[PDB]
Design a protein around this ligand. Structure first.
Ligand SMILES: *[C@@H]1O[C@H](CO)[C@@H](O)[C@H](O)[C@H]1NC(C)=O
Ligand SMILES: *[C@@H]1O[C@H](CO)[C@@H](O)[C@H](O)[C@H]1NC(C)=O
Ligand SMILES: *[C@@H]1O[C@H](CO)[C@@H](O)[C@H](O)[C@H]1NC(C)=O
Lengths: 495, 495, 495
């Protein structure tokens, strides 16, 4: 007898980590940092609801297609939800110039207030009720975009229109108008008498004369005619003037941009639920407690960072081992209040005491390294939705390559940091156990024989109050010097 | 005598590696991973030939400039080759709107099938044979684009054209038409009588009226007139209708997109050879066995990853050293079947046996680390060709900066991984040799004297069947305890 | 007595470094690499002055707004400075097509030479002096853009203009013209008689007919009319022809691009000073000696690399410690000519000599690692200025995300390299001190007793010429073997 041993923790764990050099390394303690679950619902963002467009496209909502809900309350929103191929858009077929730019402006917008600039009932010189069609039904009736007025000749005359709106508000106004492209020349005369007409609109910053492009087109939604829409932002104190002799599709209502901020247009097929989250993806919301996720690259809100992986586990503690009588062999199930420690084999002792002098010194620098690692990606790339028209394929692909590019880079960065510091964390543990050993043997020098399994045998008596002398770096060799100095020349000439 | 020594490999090698801290570190084993050679030819990709446009530009080929080869067989292709400044393009000078977008669509296209929608002989009301010119020769004759028909007034009349094609195919159709811009008003009447005309074309998704812009231009390829071409993709079940009173350049043939996939437009000056590769660059093909190359950033196919370096060598084994009598001094030329081992100096022994218990334990985790390193770049950035017109310089430069940006990032990533793990690989070797040592000395404790050069001298007799006891971690001190216990108190009072 | 100790440097320093695992680690030697100061002035770049546009926009300068300075000397420039919202632009209101593309061309341009292609006095058939207005004053007079001529009907007639310039120079010419959009039809007749007119311009590569868009606009700078400008680059040996019946704004002077190279348009509010730098940011110039800075992302010239951090310090030497009698405790203030060394406690000795065999071996591989680290970012991303119009928001944001993306990536890269190699540098120091120790104990084997504080006590006499035997790896045990062999069996049976 008369022994003491230097040893490390081992316990129930079967969680596994990876390094650069080995896979599936089981460890005592380990911290998952990759969130991979989601709730499949569409939720409010920190208490602010999304704008759910249902089956309507942004164009349909703004122009007020008869099938789309208006938002009379003028609510603010946290983001906008639009299905992948909405069914309710330009019910009257045509185009909507710079549509994609407008959707991009919607991403920085959180609240519209609709206001009337040119009231439907104020066009005295023109027909303001006939402009409706079988292509824009509202309860089976022919109807039209609620927000623009399709003016039509009155009494076979269409007197040249000039009309202005001075924007006296403090807010930017979104203003939408349009122009009508008939099938043929009879149609042009039938609706607007004047055979040759234009739609001119003037701003301080915007000058545009628009001309009816008459052509022969296939029937879309029942018609071969088309309607082309335009939009502009009228700055505070600026004014806009419209002049047309025909084919004018006149704004009735405009949109005051009353709140700018962090918003988004999310393409998703879900509908809303009584649910709230900090982080919303198109396929559902995320419990944003972890630092990384792989649910979906287009998450919005207070989100963890997207990485293309299926596992991401940090190591925090030792490897896991029975495991008998020293550190050379393995870890001690029997140690509980620490990571590295000792074992009293004494005339009274039984064993198992932890050196928390170096144990909290580890839980200090690892759990300060785990936080410091997470924060190293604070500025990691986050992707952002944008759309592109069929003639913008190159910049679409530029944008796709740029976003996939950064996601790959940051995925590489994350995996490497975890693998690299996992190798450093485990090797630290080895180091501490090896260093605990030396602290002990640097003390009991001649008074003890290293057995090479990780323990020392005493050439003297220690007693229990001395087995803390080695624990407290306070054992003095001279205390038992001459004692032991005798009793292993007794080995030298023993049996 | 009576010795044993712990030692490591050394051999013929003179291959050199680098770390963060040292350059030109010669090593025993090392794996080049940077492919830097190419074959200078243009080859088929995994058995599928490129489309070689010879001296023709994409525009020339599609419109069918008389000098360009048609591809009547409708072959599929692996990529398209176009010279840097092709000589055969718009032989009749003009423009080709959204040309660059069209070339970008060609990059996702692998096979056209040409089909006739409006046969040359079906324009009964117009001259369909006079439209040719000195600017588009075919064997010294005046001629024209084979794929579009330059219709001209018949009998001094040009009756307004309306004509339609319903796309009854399952495939997208590429359709190209154009319009003619004369020098002056006499020219306009001379060819198309009607003084004021248009070219209108209608699709479900496309509405366009085109008007002759008459102006006074310098002679290009002999003419001051110009021709402007347009293109659109007619979706399955859609139809297209053309209406013009003059200046119409009517499609005869359209292109069925029959195979989409991974393709490219490669700018290169080479011509084809009886050659096949897995990876093709503009200056030649690559033997894609390595994971990295520096030949050219625009490689296509099953390619290694492009990095801007001139060397990239992984270390796999020890440093290289004569080298005499222990690990403290250097490695042993005399060891052959392993990386770390021992040396029998015995009453019979001679020496040199490898501890493959820890040698295959290295060839396990290094050759698993070399594969694991290569795969860490599976998702590395790969550049993609695109073109831009003279008014698209900003997005050209955006695209150039984005691609150079990722190449630099991934070059940094590759070099750092190799240097960082090269430092870890060599230091592991040191560790294993130091650890082999301890395994031995943890066994022979009192029975042997460490000489500090890396060897032990025995205070007892071992014999050959004991020199495997230390090799198999199975030497028991008590076996020879009392033996040695005697014979170095014999040193204590020897000479 | 009779001792010797292995020890390391410690000194005045209080500079602190960081690693992955610890912050605020004080060290003996350390190298700041982050430049954070700037001089707040706008300086010449390596002796070449910027073009300071003062309150003029690029458009104002090129067209020659009466308030802007011309640069008659035709100076070359190192970059161009433009205020954020310049006050002197299109004094006559309108638009300037592809303005942003033109500014992007200015970034690769370092020198214009202005030349006259169509002299003001050569329009014999038109009024060339009346075209001025209250909106372009020059000393309180009505005036006009100095570089283009606003031609006006003469004697109530405006004879159709055709006019050409053959570019006989070797240099690309920048040519700017424009066209006038009146308020109403009376205005059109009042200035240009002909009711319906155009401005046509023909190049080999450029075909354009421009038509007056008459509309009713709010007064900008006093007028409701507008002027629209166009630009093109006329290649050497090419010619350009202008044809108009009215509304033509004719070039007088063109700009020969005589020097292309590295340039920039810097948005900044500063004005020039008698100052010169190697690196200029919009808020001031930088003393480009360091490798990294955080002053401003849009620096130009021979600049260090921009990273978003507030500190970036490399470690080069030991940690800093009184510190008494061995390496186990701490470093020695008393060592001066090295980093690791020894201490003579001899019958004559006092102590403190450095092992420069391993000290210069450190100042070799650290100060080769500090250079090698800096150069690892040679190809780091550098941001570049570009501008975008109000309908280019998507590519603006693409470009912003791409640049912020790379800055974040490279910031991550820089911090990690410094933290990672700081951990490697300090741990090397530990290694060297631990290795110096072993070199000594591998020599004095039986002749000395390790005291476990980092020192050895001698069982024999050494003398001063032997205390270099341990220093020069040349101590032979047999020299004092039988001596010591006696005198610690004297301990074995001493007191
Ligand atoms: C949306 O379209 C689907 C058809 O798939 C329909 O069943 C659903 O009721 C529609 N919802 C709204 C709000 O229009
Ligand atoms: C391509 O142009 C070159 C002129 O440099 C000519 O010699 C060669 O024969 C041409 N090849 C084809 C296929 O037109
Ligand atoms: C620029 O504008 C400011 C007005 O803030 C004026 O005081 C200054 O003199 C102007 N400088 C020039 C060169 O026009």
């Amino acid at each position: 007898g008369d022994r003491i041993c230097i040893g490390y923790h081992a316990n129930n764990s079967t969680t596994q980590v990876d390094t650069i050099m080995e896979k599936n390394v089981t460890v005592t303690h380990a911290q998952d940092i990759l969130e991979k679950e989601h709730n499949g619902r569409l939720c409010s963002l920190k208490g602010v609801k999304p704008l759910i467009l249902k089956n309507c496209s942004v164009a349909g909502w703004l122009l007020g297609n008869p099938m789309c809900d208006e938002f009379l309350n003028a609510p603010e929103w946290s983001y906008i939800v639009e299905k992948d191929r909405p069914s309710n858009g330009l019910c009257y077929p045509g185009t909507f110039n710079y549509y994609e730019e407008l959707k991009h402006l919607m991403s920085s917008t959180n609240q519209f207030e609709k206001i009337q600039i040119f009231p439907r009932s104020s066009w005295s010189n023109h027909d303001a009720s006939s402009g409706v069609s079988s292509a824009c039904p509202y309860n089976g009736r022919s109807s039209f975009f609620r927000n623009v007025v399709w003016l039509i000749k009155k009494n076979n005359v269409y007197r040249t229109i000039t009309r202005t709106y001075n924007n006296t508000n403090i807010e930017d106004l979104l203003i939408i108008w349009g122009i009508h492209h008939p099938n043929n020349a009879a149609e042009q005369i039938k609706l607007y008498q004047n055979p040759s007409t234009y739609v001119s609109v003037g701003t301080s910053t915007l000058n545009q004369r628009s001309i009816p492009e008459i052509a022969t087109r296939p029937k879309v939604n029942g018609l071969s005619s088309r309607m082309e829409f335009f939009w502009t932002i009228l700055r505070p104190n600026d004014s806009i003037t419209f002049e047309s002799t025909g084919n004018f599709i006149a704004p009735e209502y405009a949109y005051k941009i009353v709140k700018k901020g962090d918003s988004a247009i999310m393409k998703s097929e879900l509908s809303y639920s009584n649910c709230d989250t900090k982080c919303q993806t198109p396929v559902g919301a995320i419990n944003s407690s972890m630092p990384f996720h792989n649910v979906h690259p287009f998450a919005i809100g207070e989100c963890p960072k997207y990485v293309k992986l299926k596992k991401l586990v940090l190591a925090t503690g030792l490897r896991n081992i029975g495991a008998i009588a020293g550190f050379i062999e393995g870890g001690w199930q029997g140690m509980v209040d620490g990571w590295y420690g000792y074992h009293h084999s004494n005339e009274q002792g039984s064993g198992y005491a932890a050196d928390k002098e170096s144990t909290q010194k580890a839980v200090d620098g690892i759990t300060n390294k785990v936080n410091s690692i997470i924060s190293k990606m604070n500025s990691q790339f986050e992707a952002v939705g944008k759309e592109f028209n069929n003639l913008e394929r190159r910049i679409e692909n530029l944008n796709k390559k740029m976003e996939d590019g950064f996601i790959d880079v940051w995925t590489y960065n994350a995996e490497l940091l975890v693998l690299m510091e996992n190798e450093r964390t485990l090797d630290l543990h080895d180091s501490n156990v090896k260093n605990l050993y030396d602290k002990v043997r640097r003390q009991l020098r001649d008074n003890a024989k290293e057995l090479g399994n990780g323990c020392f045998e005493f050439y003297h008596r220690c007693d229990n109050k001395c087995m803390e002398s080695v624990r407290n770096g306070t054992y003095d060799y001279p205390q038992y010097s001459e004692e032991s100095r005798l009793k292993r020349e007794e080995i030298d000439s023993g049996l």
